[PDB]
Design a protein around this ligand. Structure first.
Ligand code: LGM
Ligand code: NA
Ligand code: NA
Lengths: 234, 52
């Protein structure tokens, strides 16, 4: 995250961190239930073998409340291709269930129509992660969060060099130099409704980070709810 | 207006059925007696920050 604020104790409990063989975070994830993690499909190419860290807020210090979980099943969307970045979604089933505690709790999955008419129509959502703090930088050791305005679908497509499909949406600022960055990928985009945080997006891609006239591109979670539901049955 | 008027006074999901507001909750919540509020069924319900 470029700009934004640190996640304080218990503020981003749904954040998951994908860690490689070298124990370094490379992508984010959202906790859906004790056995399921939501991430980006493209993240699965960033590492040969990976585990899932939860309840982590600062990578330098072992909190005690942190837990590492192994992946049993990787449920990747067959329609994903690096050529378009379309269908950038994957579900991970863990070997062991997550223990919910402070900083460890799942985000709500909304219902399709309500998410579109009530969540997507709110002024903002919150993106979070351990990704780069400047376009050219190292992975953050601290979990950060950022409130990002929902961007008008027309402005979104005009801002981009690439095709913005119906499975994607824009969020961010045209001028304010704060946005998600490399390493925030697969992480949560949540929208608060009456004190309840519902998962609305998966950090997908962007043309660099925090660049003026550009935005963060997210996988539209509403477009894959049945696919998500089906995945949690396998 | 129904659901367009303050989410039909629903805590979470709002639907329209037979020209009326019908509320529902995500998994781990039960709909209250008033048919509007959503009650967590156990510890760590989804979408709640763990601030306490
Ligand atoms: C450094 C860096 N970070 N980062 C990133 C990562 C995560 C969040 C944010 C973010 N969120 N908000 C915000 O401002 N940025 C930024 C990216 C980069 C490099 C570019 N890249 C990217 C750019 C474009 C496409 C793409 C788009 C559509 C089709 C095909 C493709 C892919 N093809 C076209 C090009 C070859 C194959 C893929 C990747 C990123 O996404
Ligand atoms: Na830690
Ligand atoms: Na921007």
């Amino acid at each position: 995250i470029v700009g934004g604020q640190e996640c304080k104790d218990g503020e981003c409990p749904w954040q998951a961190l994908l860690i490689n063989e070298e124990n370094e975070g490379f992508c984010g994830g959202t906790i859906l239930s004790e056995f399921y993690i939501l991430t980006a499909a493209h993240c699965l190419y960033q590492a040969k073998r990976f585990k899932v860290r939860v309840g982590d807020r600062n990578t330098e210090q072992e909190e005690g409340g942190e837990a590492v979980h192994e992946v049993e099943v990787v449920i990747k969307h067959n329609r994903f291709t690096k050529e378009t970045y379309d269908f950038d979604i994957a579900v991970l089933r863990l070997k062991t269930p997550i223990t919910f505690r402070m900083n460890v709790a799942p985000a709500c999955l909304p219902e399709r129509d309500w998410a579109e008419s009530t969540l997507m129509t709110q002024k903002t959502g919150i993106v979070s992660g351990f990704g780069r703090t400047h376009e050219k930088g190292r992975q953050s050791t601290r979990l950060k969060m950022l409130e990002v305005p929902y961007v008008d679908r027309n402005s979104c497509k005009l801002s981009s060099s690439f095709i913005i499909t119906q499975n994607m949406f824009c969020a961010g600022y045209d001028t304010k130099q704060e946005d998600a960055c490399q390493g925030d990928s697969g992480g949560p985009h949540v929208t608060r409704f009456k004190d309840t945080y519902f998962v609305t997006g998966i950090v997908s891609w962007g043309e660099g980070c925090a660049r003026k006239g550009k935005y963060g591109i997210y996988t539209k979670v509403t477009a894959f709810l049945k696919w998500i539901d089906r995945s949690m049955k396998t | 207006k129904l659901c367009s008027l303050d989410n039909g006074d629903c805590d979470q999901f709002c639907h329209e059925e037979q020209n009326s507001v019908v509320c529902s909750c995500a998994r781990g919540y039960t709909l209250a007696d008033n048919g509007k509020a959503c009650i967590p069924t156990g510890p760590y319900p989804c979408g709640k920050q763990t601030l306490e």
